Design a protein around this nucleic acid. Structure first.
Ligand SMILES: Nc1ncnc2c1ncn2[C@H]1C[C@H](O)[C@@H](COP(=O)(O)NP(=O)(O)OP(=O)(O)O)O1
Ligand SMILES: [Mg+2]
Ligand SMILES: [Mg+2]
Length: 430
DNA sequence: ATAATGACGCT
DNA sequence: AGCGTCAT
């Protein structure tokens, strides 16, 4: 209609590093470059857990969450790089710092929301405006978009992969109105030019390659990102959404990958995101609640309002370790020693946080899991975090959990713990 | 025995 | 507060 908002107000991108931990290890060790290789965590149980996989190794069917011993069965020449271990646990420091390299480069172009160790959303709306006045309304050359796909294109009245990409990009640019500075399609296009630049800057300055999605909101940008990996970027326009969603499995949309996703499918009897359009907002609210219903109604029309939160850094700092199977902690001395190992890494990261990012935490959350309980957390308790001191933090954590011990002989611990988790929260300026 | 973390919703 | 959900 004439009064219906179409969710084309913003230009939003999602940048995602390609096989990130592998690229970090390949940059450090050139022997691993352009080879089937994976990053593995621990190693005694079945060779350690695979947690990142180069595209060369993915062709052999190697995937994350696979034992390395099993990965070698699919790919005997697989090269492995191991995650650093400190105080008996995985230490991800190298990857955090690599991540900071990328995040700081992105921050030069626009405001970012860190979404994970290797992903960031970018609100490009302002950057695009000023680039549009700078560009004096001359056509946007395809040379400014050498790694960009236009989703849905080419269509209409042709065997080469890159050939296809160019065809669609040509069709898109030929159709574009540089006339209207407020045309959403034009804005996304300029957005993509900027992300081409941002992605060139990251590769030049860190050596890392990435993929990106450019669209009008977070969910579509994140969806766009995954359409042409690795080392490519995809523009999903508002107009592309109906065909794209028509065979897009519901579970693929961000936040619908779990139980709400499954219940949308089960209760409504549908499979694809586009099928949601046939229901009224009130019907969707009645089934999934007021907030989920409103979100769904809009999202299935490609409309979403979640803003890019201006935060390049975390707001909790935590350390955890699982103790699967036979390694479950069953003596009080064990529990105390591991609480201390966790507290020591935590103090380290915290001290760095106070120096670098000018800040102190004021609360400590202690989380454990008991054997057999197959939730992430069996129990969560809090206490004051007054001193960045590992022995006090570990002692305090024990204190707020020790009554969970069912054991008659309290030299021993029952039920056994299969997870310890310490998390610094409630940060303040300093 | 697919980890180690982080953010947010509900009550 | 403390637990449940979703994510990389
Ligand atoms: N189950 C897991 N266990 C341990 N570490 C993991 C993990 N999943 C991811 N990581 C670590 C390791 C990953 O490198 C990093 C990024 O996660 P992604 O972006 O989801 N996956 P990637 O970047 O590898 O591949 P691509 O984006 O090209 O699909 O976080
Ligand atoms: Mg990635
Ligand atoms: Mg990621």
């Amino acid at each position: 209609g004439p009064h219906m908002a179409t969710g084309q107000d913003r230009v939003v991108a999602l940048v995602d590093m390609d096989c990130f931990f592998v690229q970090v290890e390949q940059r450090q060790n050139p022997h691993l470059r352009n080879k089937p290789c994976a990053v593995v965590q621990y190693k005694s149980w079945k060779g350690g857990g695979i947690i990142a996989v180069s595209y060369e190794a993915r062709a052999f069917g190697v995937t994350r969450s696979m034992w390395a011993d099993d990965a070698k069965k699919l790919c005997p020449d697989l090269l492995l790089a191991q995650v650093r271990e400190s105080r008996g646990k995985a230490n991800l420091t190298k990857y955090r710092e690599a991540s900071v390299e990328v995040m700081e480069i992105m921050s030069r172009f626009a405001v970012i929301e860190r979404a994970s160790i290797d992903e960031a959303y970018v609100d490009l709306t302002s950057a695009v405006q000023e680039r549009l006045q700078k560009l004096q309304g001359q056509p946007i050359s395809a040379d400014l978009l050498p790694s960009t796909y236009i989703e849905g294109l080419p269509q209409g009245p042709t065997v080469q992969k890159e050939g296809m990409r160019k065809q669609g990009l040509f069709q898109w640019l030929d159709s574009l109105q540089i006339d209207n500075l407020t045309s959403p399609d034009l804005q996304l296009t300029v957005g993509a030019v900027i992300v081409e630049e941002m992605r060139a800057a990251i590769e030049r300055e860190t050596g890392f390659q990435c993929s990106a999605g450019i669209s009008h909101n977070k969910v579509l940008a994140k969806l766009a990102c995954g359409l042409n990996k690795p080392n490519r970027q995809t523009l999903v326009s508002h107009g592309s959404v109906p065909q794209l969603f028509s065979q897009m499995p519901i579970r693929k949309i961000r936040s619908l990958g779990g139980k709400l996703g499954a219940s949308v499918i089960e209760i409504l009897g549908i499979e694809y995101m586009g099928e949601l359009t046939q229901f009224t907002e009130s019907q969707l609210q009645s089934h999934f609640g007021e907030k989920n219903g409103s979100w769904l109604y809009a999202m299935c029309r490609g409309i979403e309002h979640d803003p890019v939160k201006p935060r390049q850094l975390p707001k909790t700092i935590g350390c955890s370790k699982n103790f699967p199977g036979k390694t479950a902690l069953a003596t009080r001395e064990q529990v105390q020693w591991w609480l201390l190992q966790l507290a020591q890494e935590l103090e380290e990261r915290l001290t760095k946080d106070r120096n670098d990012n000018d800040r102190v935490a004021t609360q400590l959350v202690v989380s454990i899991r008991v054997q057999g309980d197959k939730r992430l957390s069996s129990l969560r308790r809090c206490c004051a975090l007054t001193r960045y001191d590992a022995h006090k933090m570990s002692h305090d954590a024990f204190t707020v959990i020790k009554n969970c011990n069912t054991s008659g002989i309290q030299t021993e611990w029952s039920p056994p713990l299969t997870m310890l988790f310490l998390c610094a929260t409630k940060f303040s300026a300093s």
